[PDB]
Design a protein around this ligand. Structure first.
Ligand code: CHL
Ligand code: CLA
Ligand code: CLA
Ligand code: CLA
Ligand code: CLA
Ligand code: CLA
Ligand code: CLA
Ligand code: CLA
Ligand code: CLA
Ligand SMILES: CC1=C(/C=C/C(C)=C/C=C/C(C)=C/C=C/C=C(C)/C=C/C=C(C)/C=C/C2=C(C)CCCC2(C)C)C(C)(C)CCC1
Ligand code: SF4
Ligand SMILES: [Ca+2]
Lengths: 202, 39, 733, 101, 80, 178
């Protein structure tokens, strides 16, 4: 909580900073319930897990020469029946995770094993570094998804083009997104408006 | 779009905006209004 | 104890449905809210004003956006006579196969509806020619709407809320409104007319990228700073001149040509600039009349105190009227509504006779829809003016302040005023109905010669005095030796005479014996509505049947069934009764307008002139003949574009009939019925588990009158709008 | 016709008129009129910085009742009453305004 | 509930107390009329607003007035 | 301290001290905020006018008004987004300083050990003069369609003729450039 998102922003009253990743940013008051924010937090961390694994899941195949840069299932060895066993094994695993989460919270385990500290590592800083890296990968995966604007260019390949020309190869001009300028415009003026509103309403 | 950006809307615009303000918006509006009417 | 009516603890402590309904009724009566002071009242009004401005600008921005996205504006500019304007697109999952095939009009890929607002001609006249200019201007209007919303919130904050004297300052308000809002805005508009509208009408493209490099006039301000101001009117646009290109164009900007344009049938664009410029100079020079914080100007209180005739004509004159007007809000609201309602009708009467937009006279549905819309709006605003006058007399009229003045003096002979209004209304009603029934019976006995036909020798005389040489009155402006004809003979009289002598436009239509009776019907409706409203306003604070009416408020049910019965005795009830008469009067004036133009547009002007004298002729040739294509919107042989109008034509009838229910049936019958339903829900199995949070009760007496009037007015409006647009759109363009 | 002599000979005539023969009549005529205050309320203690009449001395500088802003106010007669005569270009532009009859 | 008022122009005929169907008005002694009694209204919270007292009032103008106001369960005449 | 015979200011501890015929102040909070506006507006105008003069003296076939469109490696499309972030950071941080009071740049005060005490009235006065000079540059550039040095040269070359009045009377030649 002392860091704060833009310059000096009054941190929300509900966020006392008790949570390890309280950057002080939480707009529209989506989470303010005591029992609801804990579950939302569990969602955010589970998201980061799937997304971090995802970011490095596309990074490996993309770096080397292979197929599926944009579309998966070029061949494979199991069709449709595979998908059924996928949902079955995941349903059993997920039911165990939900049962474990209800008992202690911050469910970090594989199958049915309440706490999973195999490596014996679990300090506070590692809890925090999990969150910050998950937030980063959740915001990086969208750029991997944003390959649509860049079309055939892949994640590693989009980086290569941007290296060749740093001014005519960006979202602001080389992409079809001309509204990105308006996004950064309103994202730049929004802070000042919050400070302005709160200041005026003395 | 192209040379028309200033308020030029994509093709599936009424197919996703009319199903929104005609069912989702009056439902959330009436729900919030009913909870505000009662104590 | 609930918390929804935050402004009223009395309604907040109501254990019935009456709390909900009333919670939506007194939401804007800031003068009767719990714990409200004069300063708080004025500040709340100042905020709601900004909210209204923001929603107005947002609405017009949305109109520009929809026409720029789905309207065929670029296709309409290249051919403003054949193609039809497009309002917006239609997306309905309820539509069938034939509805999608039949709703596609105007050269579109999907189903759309033609626009009757007439904004295409307005934008094409002011200068908008591309589909992008509407886009950029729509985002500009949305931006200014956002600023107004911020301004309203900004002023609702401490150290930013204006004081009471700032609101109670009329001298600087009138000075700034007459100089800046009315004059500077008009000067900026004539600047746009001379810099963009005039060159765009002559093919010269002028936009934000080249308006600083193109001079509006060849001379270039050189005559404005020199004694040669007539240089701006050297070569006007000739007759053979196209409105899109420079074929036959001119270089003049501030001309003075009477009449219209030979191709667009509208006023010369080089004349509206001159008009707005003269109006701007007049308003700016008139805005320096009152005294602000300087050593010059006038004082409104001093002028009002000095305006008192001697020999006791008005007694105290206008003494105390300044404090009476400035201290009250309903007086200012009634005056503003009266002025706005009068100028709205003025706008309606001048737009059809003198069309100001290019290719507007060709569009027959646009003119009818615009005239009907402006006249109905004017009628509702005119009823509101008298309603607020009655509210003023009840809420803020203290008799001890203005003793013996004109306001207290007109109240002394309210019986004389009301009685003379009653006599005028009875005279017009008896005679107009008698002449119509006499002509009807005589026409029904197979003898049309016997019917009485009065030629309006007064309005025909006015038309002959203004230029029309059809009647034969050798008077001024129609002669050749009158001083008024020689005056202006070289200024605007040739164009004005050429436009008034043509029998194809709408400028001073040829009247006859059929317009005499209709004009008398219009006079009857006006005097009757004025009688109801004036009687409800003067007898608002007391009567001989109820002298303490002022102690009961403005909208009460009655004062029991005693003393004969006092049903509908409040001034609210009087206004309620006057709404019906206002609707009838506006219906009569619009029926007259639509039939005269409906017979003029089809070259059968002799149909209305000989079939408008009897009411059976009205019902046959107007309501029955022009409704052949409207009801044929959907039959067992399919449907067409008019089917939507046919559907809403019946939808209006259903709303009207539902209003008759709330008007005829009264609350007690319904109260007993609701009680029986309560017993039913309480003693029923498997449904007694649920229960109402608020006790169900019948609507109140005042609420029942309001809902019935709303249903009556909505049906009356929807049915006529459907018939007008369908009957005009169905057989014309 | 000449703009220099029609708006110049105008200003001085409107100024000398307002300073020599219409000044005591204007001052005697403006005495019955009151200022902007709503019958004199408290201003300085209520923050009414806009209604209060502008100071800037506002005292006698000339003789027989002077005018600081009246010299710029009454001077508008120069353009209100004679820029019309100065711009009388219709006397040589063919558009006759004599109004025969 | 509704606000009932009794003015001094009362003659003490005791007709409003007889016309009231909810026992709202009463007759207290007075020293300003021939009957030496004036009406009063102690049970104002039980006023329903049927205005029968105003019809029973014989003096001109009425000595008793029923000014309607806020509604409660008792003043709305609800039996449920 | 004063200028002429009318009574002085309502508050007199600020650098500039004169009269105002409209009196837009009379609110200590609005006075403090408004005095900051004067210093920051003058800061931008001082830099702007000295920049226009420099661009005019050095040159690169483009006037400050026509300087909007003149090539560049990075296009105006990406120019705005980068400009907003930089300006948004700097300006929002600067507003942070005002809450704790004082004028700050990168951080609070930003005084690189230079004269400050009595050296202030000159800073406000120089800023005010640059503000009125910039509005003159703009209307001068709009009316004459030239740069302030060329306009000074045109007035230096001929004084009685080729004056401001000349620029109002002739527009068909000034635009054409004849
Ligand atoms: C911050 C103050 C600022 C001011 C006073 C101006 C003023 C101006 N800019 Mg400019 N700009 C400014 C900031 C910026 N501009 C631009 C990008 C442009 C462009 C791309 C253009 C201008 C142009 C212009 C001129 C347009 C002339 C006209 O009729 O306009 C109304 C004008 C003198 C136009 C020009 O040079 O026209 C000749 C033009 O084409 N500006 C950017 C982002 C790169 C700015 C960022 O702050
Ligand atoms: C105002 C906005 C609005 C909109 C957008 C719609 C839209 C629609 N209406 Mg409708 N309606 C409206 C207003 C509106 N209505 C009003 C005001 C009325 C009162 C007069 C009606 C009365 C009305 C009637 C009487 C009927 C419709 C019907 C329909 C549907 C058209 C027929 C169809 O294709 O079936 C839809 C076919 C589908 C495949 C849609 C399925 C998707 C639905 C909407 C949601 C189902 C998903 C489900 C929740 C999954 C759950 C997820 C789970 C994992 C938890 C359509 C989607 C018809 C209908 O419903 O069809 C039976 C129909 O009978 N409407
Ligand atoms: C030549 C002598 C003369 C004449 C003829 C007048 C005439 C007039 N003076 Mg004036 N006056 C004079 C000398 C004169 N004055 C002198 C020497 C002075 C001293 C300098 C003044 C100072 C003076 C002042 C200060 C004022 C007047 C005013 C008036 C006007 C109204 C007077 C009045 O009593 O209202 C009329 C009396 C009534 C009872 C009104 C009757 C209302 C009717 C009945 C209503 C009917 C309406 C009905 C609906 C009509 C139907 C028509 C349909 C189209 C609707 C009036 C036209 C007053 C004014 O300016 O008003 C315009 C004003 O305040 N005079
Ligand atoms: C740089 C990324 C990063 C960081 C610093 C952490 C840090 C942490 N993780 Mg974690 N995690 C990550 C990514 C990361 N994770 C990814 C990509 C996955 C998907 C496979 C997971 C899935 C995961 C699980 C299942 C668990 C952790 C847990 C933990 C905590 C102790 C274990 C450890 O030291 O590791 C530490 C609190 C454990 C925990 O209980 O958190 C408190 C837990 O068991 N993580
Ligand atoms: C010169 C300075 C100035 C200006 C420009 C304004 C402007 C305005 N003031 Mg303001 N005011 C001022 C000074 C000024 N004020 C001062 C100094 C004071 C304090 C003494 C006030 C105190 C004050 C108050 C208390 C209020 C306003 C309000 C308003 C708004 C009026 C509503 C409106 O927009 O109608 C628009 C009017 C016009 C466009 C002209 C009149 C239109 C007529 C009827 C003719 C129609 C034109 C034409 C025929 C139609 C063409 C359009 C068509 C083609 C579509 C308006 C924007 C009100 C407000 O808050 O906002 C609502 C209000 O409550 N003012
Ligand atoms: C400048 C315009 C203006 C303004 C500011 C006011 C302001 C006010 N009016 Mg007034 N009035 C006006 C014009 C105006 N009026 C006009 C034009 C009329 C004639 C119609 C009236 C007639 C009128 C009456 C009779 C009364 C007032 C009253 C009041 C006061 C409070 C009631 C209220 O506003 O709450 C808000 C009211 C509502 C929210 C009700 C809205 C329901 C509307 C009318 C029905 C909408 C039609 C329908 C549903 C449309 C949908 C169609 C469907 C097919 C989709 C308030 C100070 C009342 C009063 O003085 O207090 C006792 C009073 O009784 N007004
Ligand atoms: C108020 C509206 C109205 C008016 C103005 C008229 C007017 C007229 N109607 Mg009509 N009518 C009306 C309503 C009206 N009607 C209605 C509502 C109906 C349906 C029921 C009819 C149905 C109707 C029919 C069927 C007919 C008429 C006819 C006539 C004409 C008859 C003239 C007449 O009666 O002979 C003369 C009457 C008298 C001379 C009466 C004598 C009275 C005494 C004795 C004399 C008066 C004193 C004398 C003048 C001396 C005074 C001295 C003085 C100079 C000082 C007349 C022009 C007839 C016609 O011919 O059509 C043209 C006819 O056929 N009407
Ligand atoms: C508010 C002050 C201000 C502003 C807005 C500008 C703006 C601009 N200057 Mg500039 N300049 C300024 C002050 C200013 N200058 C000052 C004080 C000087 C010294 C007297 C200069 C000297 C200068 C030169 C020599 C040149 C510019 C140039 C330019 C243009 C592109 C250069 C650029 O910014 O690239 C990027 C900026 C980075 C910091 C990187 C640009 C529109 C160039 C140009 O092309 O003129 C049109 C150019 O050649 N300026
Ligand atoms: C602030 C210092 C300053 C200085 C040193 C100058 C100097 C000059 N200006 Mg100038 N000007 C200024 C401010 C200044 N101006 C301001 C604030 C404005 C906004 C109104 C103008 C508007 C202006 C115009 C429109 C013109 C000049 C012109 C000129 C040149 C010819 C003389 C002249 O007509 O003056 C300026 C005439 C005025 C009426 C403005 C002076 C009034 C200020 C308050 C002093 C000259 C070198 C003329 C030119 O460009 O020469 C080719 C010209 O036409 N100026
Ligand atoms: C109840 C009341 C109220 C309200 C009222 C009202 C509503 C009124 C109105 C009214 C109206 C609504 C009016 C109207 C009007 C108008 C007029 C009266 C006019 C005029 C004019 C003239 C005289 C003209 C002339 C001419 C010319 C100049 C030109 C051409 C020719 C002619 C001849 C046409 C108030 C609030 C105040 C309060 C008190 C009471
Ligand atoms: S409105 Fe109803 S309660 Fe009142 S007197 Fe008429 S019938 Fe009786
Ligand atoms: Ca254009």
């Amino acid at each position: 909580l002392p860091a704060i998102p833009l310059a000096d922003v009054q941190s929300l009253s509900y966020l006392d900073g008790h949570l390890p990743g309280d950057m002080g940013f939480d707009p529209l008051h989506l989470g303010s319930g005591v029992l609801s924010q804990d579950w939302l937090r569990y969602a955010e961390v589970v998201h980061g897990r799937w997304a971090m694994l995802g970011v490095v899941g596309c990074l490996t195949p993309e770096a080397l020469a292979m197929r599926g840069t944009i579309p998966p299932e070029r061949g494979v060895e199991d069709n449709q029946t595979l998908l059924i066993i996928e949902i079955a094994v995941f349903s059993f695993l997920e039911s165990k995770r939900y049962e474990g989460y209800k008992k202690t919270g911050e469910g970090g385990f594989i199958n049915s094993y309440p706490f999973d500290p195999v490596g014996l590592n679990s300090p506070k800083h590692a809890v925090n570094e999990l969150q910050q890296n998950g937030r980063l990968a959740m915001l990086a995966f969208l750029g991997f998804a944003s390959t649509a604007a860049v079309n055939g260019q892949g994640p590693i390949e989009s980086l290569q083009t941007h290296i060749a020309d740093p001014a005519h190869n960006n979202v602001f001009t080389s992409s079809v997104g001309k509204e990105s300028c308006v996004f950064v415009a309103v994202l730049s003026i929004l802070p000042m408006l919050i400070e302005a509103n709160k200041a005026l309403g003395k | 779009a192209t040379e028309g950006y200033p308020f030029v809307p994509p093709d599936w615009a009424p197919a996703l905006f009319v199903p929104l303000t005609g069912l989702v918006l009056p439902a959330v509006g009436m729900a919030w209004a009913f909870t505000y009417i009662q104590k | 104890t609930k918390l929804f009516p935050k402004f009223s603890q009395g309604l907040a402590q109501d254990p019935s449905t009456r709390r909900i309904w009333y919670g939506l009724a007194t939401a804007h009566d800031f003068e009767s809210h719990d714990g409200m002071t004069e300063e708080n009242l004025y500040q709340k009004i100042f905020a709601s004003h900004f909210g209204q401005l923001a929603i107005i600008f947002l609405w017009t921005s949305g109109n520009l956006f929809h026409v720029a996205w789905q309207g065929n504006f670029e296709q309409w500019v290249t051919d403003p006579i054949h193609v039809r304007p497009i309002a917006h697109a239609i997306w309905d999952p309820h539509f069938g196969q034939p509805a999608v095939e039949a709703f596609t009009r105007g050269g579109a890929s999907g189903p759309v509806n033609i626009a009757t607002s007439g904004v295409y001609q307005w934008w094409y006249t002011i200068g908008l020619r591309s589909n992008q200019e509407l886009y950029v201007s729509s985002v500009f209007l949305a931006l200014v709407s956002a600023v107004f919303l911020f301004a309203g919130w900004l002023h609702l904050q401490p150290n930013f809320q204006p004081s009471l004297s700032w609101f109670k300052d009329a001298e600087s308000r009138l000075n700034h409104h007459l100089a800046g809002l009315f004059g500077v805005s008009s000067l900026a508009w004539t600047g746009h007319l001379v810099h963009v509208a005039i060159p765009e009408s002559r093919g010269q493209h002028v936009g934000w990228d080249n308006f600083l490099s193109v001079l509006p006039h060849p001379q270039g301000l050189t005559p404005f700073w020199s004694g040669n101001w007539a240089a701006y009117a050297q070569n006007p646009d000739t007759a053979s001149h196209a409105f899109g290109t420079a074929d036959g164009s001119g270089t003049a900007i501030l001309t003075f040509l009477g009449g219209f344009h030979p191709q667009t049938q509208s006023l010369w664009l080089s004349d509206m600039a001159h008009h707005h410029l003269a109006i701007a100079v007049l308003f700016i020079v008139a805005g320096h009349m009152y005294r602000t914080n300087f050593g010059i100007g006038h004082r409104l209180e001093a002028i009002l105190e000095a305006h008192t005739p001697p020999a006791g004509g008005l007694g105290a004159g206008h003494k105390g009227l300044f404090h009476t007007v400035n201290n009250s809000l309903h007086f200012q609201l009634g005056l503003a509504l009266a002025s706005v309602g009068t100028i709205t009708s003025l706008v309606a009467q001048h737009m059809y006779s003198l069309p100001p937009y290019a290719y507007l006279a060709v569009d027959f549905t646009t003119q009818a829809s615009l005239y009907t819309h402006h006249q109905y709006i004017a009628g509702f605003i005119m009823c509101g003016a008298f309603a607020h006058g009655a509210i003023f007399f009840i809420r803020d009229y203290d008799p001890e302040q203005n003793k013996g003045n004109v306001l207290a003096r007109v109240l002394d002979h309210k019986e004389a005023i009301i009685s003379h209004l009653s006599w005028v209304s009875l005279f017009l009603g008896f005679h107009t109905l008698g002449l119509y029934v006499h002509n009807d019976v005589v026409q029904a006995f197979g003898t049309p010669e016997k019917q009485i036909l009065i030629e309006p020798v007064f309005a025909q005389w006015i038309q002959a005095a203004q230029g029309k040489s059809l009647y034969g009155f050798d008077l001024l402006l129609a002669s050749s030796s009158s001083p008024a004809y020689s005056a202006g003979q070289s200024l605007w009289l040739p164009g004005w005479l050429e436009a008034i002598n043509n029998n194809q436009n709408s400028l001073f239509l040829t009247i006859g014996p059929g317009d005499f009776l209709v004009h008398h019907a219009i006079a009857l409706g006006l005097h009757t509505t004025t009688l109801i409203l004036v009687k409800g306003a003067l007898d608002a604070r007391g009567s001989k049947l109820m002298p303490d009416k002022k102690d009961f408020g403005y909208s009460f049910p009655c004062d029991g069934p005693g003393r004969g019965g006092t049903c509908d005795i409040s001034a609210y009830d009087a206004f309620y009764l006057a709404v019906f008469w206002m609707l009838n009067t506006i219906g009569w004036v619009t029926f007259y307008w639509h039939w005269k133009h409906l017979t003029l547009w089809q070259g059968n002007v002799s149909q209305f002139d000989e079939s408008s004298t009897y009411l059976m002729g009205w019902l046959r040739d107007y309501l029955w003949l022009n409704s052949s294509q409207l009801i044929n919107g959907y039959n067992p042989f399919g449907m067409n574009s008019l089917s939507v109008w046919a559907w809403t034509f019946l939808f209006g009838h259903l709303v009207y009939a539902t209003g008759f229910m709330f008007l005829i049936s009264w609350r007690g019958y319904w109260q007993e019925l609701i009680e029986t339903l309560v017993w039913a829900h309480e003693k029923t199995p498997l449904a007694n588990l649920v229960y109402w949070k608020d006790k169900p009760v019948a609507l109140s007496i005042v609420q029942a009158r309001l809902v019935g009037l709303a249903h009556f007015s909505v049906g009356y409006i929807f049915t006529y709008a459907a018939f007008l647009i369908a009957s005009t759109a169905g057989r014309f363009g | 016709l000449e703009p220099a002599v029609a708006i110049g000979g105008s200003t001085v005539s409107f100024l000398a008129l307002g300073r020599f023969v219409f000044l005591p009549y204007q001052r005697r005529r403006t005495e019955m009129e009151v200022g902007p205050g709503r019958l004199g309320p408290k201003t300085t203690g209520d923050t009414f910085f806009d209604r209060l009449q502008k100071p800037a001395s506002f005292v006698e500088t000339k003789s027989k009742d002077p005018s600081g802003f009246g010299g710029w106010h009454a001077a508008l007669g120069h353009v209100f009453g004679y820029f019309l005569l100065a711009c009388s270009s219709l006397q040589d532009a063919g558009q006759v305004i004599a109004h025969w009859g | 509930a509704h606000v009932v008022k009794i003015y001094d122009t009362c003659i003490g005929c005791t007709q409003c107390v007889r016309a009231c169907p909810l026992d709202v008005l009463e007759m207290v002694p007075w020293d300003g009329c021939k009957a030496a009694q004036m009406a009063s209204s102690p049970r104002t919270e039980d006023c329903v607003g049927c205005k029968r007292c105003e019809t029973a009032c014989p003096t001109d103008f009425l000595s008793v007035r029923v000014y309607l106001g806020n509604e409660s369960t008792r003043s709305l005449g609800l039996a449920y | 301290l004063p200028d002429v015979i009318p009574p002085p200011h309502l508050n007199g501890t600020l650098p500039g001290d004169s009269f105002d015929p409209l009196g837009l102040g009379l609110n200590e909070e609005r006075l403090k905020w408004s005095v900051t506006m004067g210093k920051t507006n003058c800061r931008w105008a001082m830099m702007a006018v000295t920049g226009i003069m420099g661009q005019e003296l050095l040159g690169v076939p483009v006037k400050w008004f026509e300087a909007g469109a003149a090539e560049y490696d990075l296009p105006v499309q990406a120019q705005v987004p980068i400009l907003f972030l930089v300006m948004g950071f700097l300006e929002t941080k600067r507003f942070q300083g005002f809450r704790e009071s004082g004028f700050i740049n990168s951080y609070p005060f930003d005084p690189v050990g230079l004269n400050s005490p009595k050296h202030a009235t000159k800073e406000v006065k120089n800023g005010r003069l640059a503000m009125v000079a910039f509005v003159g540059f703009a209307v001068q550039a709009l009316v004459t369609r030239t740069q302030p040095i060329e306009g000074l040269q045109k007035h230096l070359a001929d004084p009685f003729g080729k004056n401001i009045t000349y620029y109002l009377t002739h527009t068909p030649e000034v635009i054409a450039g004849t």
